[PDB]
């Protein structure tokens, strides 16, 4: 069980860790989160009481180092930082725990939610989508744009998701124009799985990372990306059975976890109705369809 201490909390902020969150008052003696389950990625994130704009946060994995938070009064945000002095860090952490200034990562033991939403997400892959290689953790916020968005301005701050585009040469073989546009199996399986992603797990990992960035930061380009990756599979006639079963599981937990009041901007009416009702894979997402209907039959 690992710990992310906080130096202080100088400004009133709502702190999230994964799907949990806590209100922290200006100069309240809050000094970290403890009992963070090892073995998965995690995301700590923030929304200032005074700017309900720019939700921001940090992806990390406690196996990759000791990380802590520290408010910067110049840049005005809570920053993640790595402590290299392993002894100086156990020291900080033990003292804060003794004084019980830390909240416990509040995992119910029956609950596989976070595992389910991060099954395929691997920190090394995140750091290739969010390139900032001097740090072992990755920052994302509400307003960061994607590489695809940029093509249609600052690259250092881009989300380098894999570009998917149904009306591109990449997607469409010469001579198979109609075939390939109506049945994206070749784009999915040869171009994307075998070519770029190498395997289904990295594909599902990017898909899950995009969903989470949309949910936690309302990052619009991530939502675009999550929807594209869903559509690419649903619109392929020929998908491995193991990918379809897993997809239905992945989407189920993502739909289950979404805040109910956000379904209007995070869910793309066209893609969902096409995937669940028109696509090759209409009958292959039984759980995703059952939960979508019983929770958001309006969108459908």
């Amino acid at each position: 069980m690992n710990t992310v201490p906080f130096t202080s909390a100088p400004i009133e902020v709502t702190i999230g860790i994964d799907q949990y969150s806590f209100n922290v008052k200006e100069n309240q003696p809050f000094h970290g989160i403890k009992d963070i389950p090892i073995g998965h990625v995690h995301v700590i994130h923030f929304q200032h009481a005074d700017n309900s704009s720019m939700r921001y946060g940090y992806w990390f994995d406690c196996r990759m180092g000791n990380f802590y938070i520290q408010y910067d009064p110049k840049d005005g945000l809570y920053k993640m930082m790595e402590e290299r002095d392993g002894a100086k860090f156990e020291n900080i952490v033990h003292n804060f725990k003794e004084r019980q200034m830390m909240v416990s990562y509040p995992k119910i033991d029956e609950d596989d939610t976070w595992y389910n939403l991060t099954e395929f997400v691997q920190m090394d892959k995140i750091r290739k989508i969010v390139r900032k290689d001097e740090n072992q953790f990755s920052y994302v916020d509400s307003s960061m744009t994607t590489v695809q968005e940029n093509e249609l301005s600052d690259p250092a701050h881009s989300l380098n998701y894999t570009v998917i585009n149904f009306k591109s040469r990449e997607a469409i073989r010469p001579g198979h124009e109609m075939e390939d546009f109506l049945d994206k199996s070749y784009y999915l399986n040869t171009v994307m799985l075998q070519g770029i992603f190498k395997n289904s797990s990295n594909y599902f990992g990017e898909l899950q990372f995009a969903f989470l960035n949309a949910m936690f930061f309302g990052n619009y380009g991530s939502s675009l990306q999550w929807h594209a990756m869903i559509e690419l599979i649903c619109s392929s006639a020929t998908v491995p059975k193991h990918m379809l079963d897993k997809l239905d599981e992945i989407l189920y937990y993502q739909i289950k976890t979404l805040p109910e009041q956000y379904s209007d901007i995070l869910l793309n009416e066209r893609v969902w109705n096409i995937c669940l009702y028109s696509s090759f894979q209409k009958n292959s997402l039984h759980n995703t369809e059952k939960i979508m209907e019983n929770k958001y039959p309006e969108l459908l």
Binding site: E177, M178, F181
Partner: protein
């Protein structure tokens, strides 16, 4: 963006563009089978691809053989259209390739877009105009060449005959679309108006009678009258 009444004069500037109409590509007769079921029989069709500035018409004839052993023919017809238009562009020298292609039906955008991926600087556009290009098979010489064809075949025409010698593209297109609107609403009356006078002939290299300028005024008035009439009948006004 879409083409509409506002940007109508753009059709006659010096930017090469083509209209593509796919409405006569997949043509069938519907009939009863011995058992009493309905079947279709396909007849030859055509892609209507027209430069509205110059009158040049690229009439690509769609031979019924194209459909043999194919499913979802109405959907294929859109891709076959797009394939043939794309090949038509590839066949043209660079300086003749269009800068724009305006499709008269929106369902053609994606098929043409995909087929034109090799031509990213050719803008594929829809239109909000209700152009009558479906009445093209009401032009006797165009329907004859389509129905006689025994193989795929491209036939080139000037759909303005020699009008541009004496009028502008804008006026030439407005005549064309008025003649076709009338053929579309009441073919029999329309053709009557055009041929009632035996002494006005169609040249062997033309589609339409050799009306003088004054005779064209009377023709155009008669076509307008025809169109207004049919409207009150349809709607009881």
């Amino acid at each position: 963006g879409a083409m509409n009444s506002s940007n109508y004069a753009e059709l006659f500037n010096n930017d090469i563009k083509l209209f593509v109409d796919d409405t006569n590509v997949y043509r069938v007769t519907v009939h009863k089978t011995f058992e009493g079921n309905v079947a279709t029989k396909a007849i030859n069709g055509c892609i209507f691809t027209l430069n509205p500035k110059t009158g040049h018409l690229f009439l690509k004839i769609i031979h019924t053989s194209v459909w043999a052993g194919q499913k979802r023919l109405s959907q294929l017809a859109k891709w076959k259209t797009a394939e043939e238009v794309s090949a038509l562009v590839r066949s043209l020298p660079k300086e003749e390739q269009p800068k724009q292609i305006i499709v008269t039906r929106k369902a053609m955008l994606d098929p043409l877009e995909v087929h034109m991926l090799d031509f990213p600087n050719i803008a594929i556009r829809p239109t909000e105009l209700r152009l009558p290009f479906s009445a093209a098979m009401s032009i006797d010489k165009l329907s004859d060449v389509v129905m006689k064809a025994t193989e795929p075949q491209m036939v080139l025409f000037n759909i303005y005959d020699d009008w541009l010698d004496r009028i502008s593209s804008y006026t030439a297109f407005s005549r064309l679309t008025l003649l076709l609107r009338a053929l579309k609403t009441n073919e029999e009356s329309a053709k009557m108006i055009l041929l009632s006078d035996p002494t006005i002939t169609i040249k062997s290299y033309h589609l339409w009678p050799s009306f003088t300028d004054e005779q064209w005024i009377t023709i155009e008035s008669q076509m307008r009258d025809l169109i207004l009439t049919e409207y009150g009948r349809k709607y009881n006004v």
